[PDB]
Symmetry: C3
Subunit: 253 residues, 3 copies
Amino acid sequence: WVKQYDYEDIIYETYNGIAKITINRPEVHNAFRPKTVNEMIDAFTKARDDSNIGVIILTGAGGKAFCSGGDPRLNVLDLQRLIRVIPKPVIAMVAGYAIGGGHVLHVVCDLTIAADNAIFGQTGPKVGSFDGGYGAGYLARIVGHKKAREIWYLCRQYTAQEALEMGLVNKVVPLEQLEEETVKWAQEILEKSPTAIRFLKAAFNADSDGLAGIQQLAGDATLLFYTTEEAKEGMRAFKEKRKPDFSQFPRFP
Amino acid sequence: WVKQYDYEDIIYETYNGIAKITINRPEVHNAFRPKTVNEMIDAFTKARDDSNIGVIILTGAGGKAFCSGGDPRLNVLDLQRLIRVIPKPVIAMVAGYAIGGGHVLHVVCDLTIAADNAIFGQTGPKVGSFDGGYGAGYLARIVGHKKAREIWYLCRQYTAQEALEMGLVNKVVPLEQLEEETVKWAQEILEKSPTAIRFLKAAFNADSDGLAGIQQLAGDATLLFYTTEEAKEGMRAFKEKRKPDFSQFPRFP
Amino acid sequence: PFEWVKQYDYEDIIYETYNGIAKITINRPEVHNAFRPKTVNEMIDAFTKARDDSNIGVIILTGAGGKAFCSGGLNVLDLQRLIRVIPKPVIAMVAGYAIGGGHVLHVVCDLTIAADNAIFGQTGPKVGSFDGGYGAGYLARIVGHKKAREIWYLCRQYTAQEALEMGLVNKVVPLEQLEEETVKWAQEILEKSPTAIRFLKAAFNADSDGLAGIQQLAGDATLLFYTTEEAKEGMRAFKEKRKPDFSQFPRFP
């Protein structure tokens, strides 16, 4: 990993197309405060524009904590949306605690790889808080409504195996092989058509986000369209102060 | 448990913040007729209005039947909606049969704790009936479309263990421990912030019910708003006949 | 046992009927039952034939050999919609490979019965393509977003047992008993109300297809309504050049 920029509350490194973002607050079990969130925003954005990065990993430094949520601007919501809009798969690498806002964060990541020591759960109803956005509805679109309501109403803790069984995480491995497996998964992704991946991610987002999700799927198509010759004719003619000729191009039943 | 009002087909009892509504027709496996549904709507309404009650348990009497379903009018549909709109978590405590209309009832309940003798399944297609509302789509949002379509199309019966494995119920325990476990889960919820829970339940309902769901979520936000200094300024400035002063209060944002 | 009656003449497929059951077999084992425009067109035709045959109440889709259901390839998009609009349950009988477009086909079928040798998976981002329609959102509505995004991003293969465990298929049995089991399930559906079934299937589709799903659900309501005295009066009165009298029919709440 090559430490790429200089952050305070987190760490940003890269390697062979993979970008890893690490919350670094083991003292408070990698909890997040307004500042550390803003840094994650900047970092993801950095990875977003970096055409050499095709996959992103999110993890905690502790070794026994991924994130435990936060310590009065609700900027994590902005990060949740960002993680979903980035046209690149985001893998949450979970070790130890993934609680509260921290659990919602691993939830919105495309995939989650957990160490056998990982602990999952919400805390809101206990400490006077709640995430009724992706934290509720999207979670229910992963584990189903009975389990999602259980998770929020009782605020119990769930081990990796429990998480795996309910479809909350994609895989569980010993703590010592966590990053090894995660990088393995990241590389497999780096071998696929990047455009085919961004389109599917958008399609998955459109599944639950109405027009917001359609803006993403339709947006990507607009991007791809500007690539075609047909599209070129459009702005070419505009510049040439003439009427464009699309008949030159084909249709498709 | 302390019994209060006098219902004929059901029993209403409360205990340290828990309201337990019991369908009392063991001779027909706690199947429901218009009368018993009307009373359940009444009882659920009483539990709704009791500021001491925070969780509601729904169950059947006698050990081998939660509810066998319906014995014109289809008032259970009104009950399903009430169950979902009440700001308090409702737990289906299933012992034995939860069939047909009865199965949909345990389904719309937030959580379900089942005894090892519990039997699950739909019967509509067999007996000339069907529930394509929460009975279909919502069931699919718990067990998945493949499993949900299987349940309705073949109308087979499922064990408690099979129900657990597909995510249909939250927990399974021997018949002798059912109520203790259910009460235990209820008390755990009773230790949480009532407002946190109602907002979470509304958000979950908003995930699948469009505007009807948003009305619940937005409505709670209004109730909450009425508790602020900002809103009261408007109410009083509407009682004092003077242009309200809102710049007085902060922006978050 | 079962003697299928081949009923037409197709090049890439085979259409046979037993007794209430229609079976459509992709017959291009040389390319692991991969489909080309023609085989898709032939499937559209065959499914349409099963749709109009009032003696068919269930449909089976399968691959010719015992090592492939379909291995994949747009007009297949029309097929997907057809399989869903047809008011009869469709059962994918999977032996061997169910990959790429072939995996989506089994996915959209109401139920899936797989042989222990069945293999499932997507190959979109590997072979240059993707299915962001039912291929993504609907799959997510079966196995959850975490798993669905995993299936598409890594394009790995999944055994019959792994597909069962994640709710992707309904049942798994030894290769030699595949049809026997499938037919068994089909005959169970056949003894159910055809009308109750079509309404539930329509309701399931309405769960995720907005106005398109509602068109199907309302459409069946319309069809039913036509066989009522109330409706016939409106018709009769129109033919008799007189104003209708619906007062002779009961209101209901």
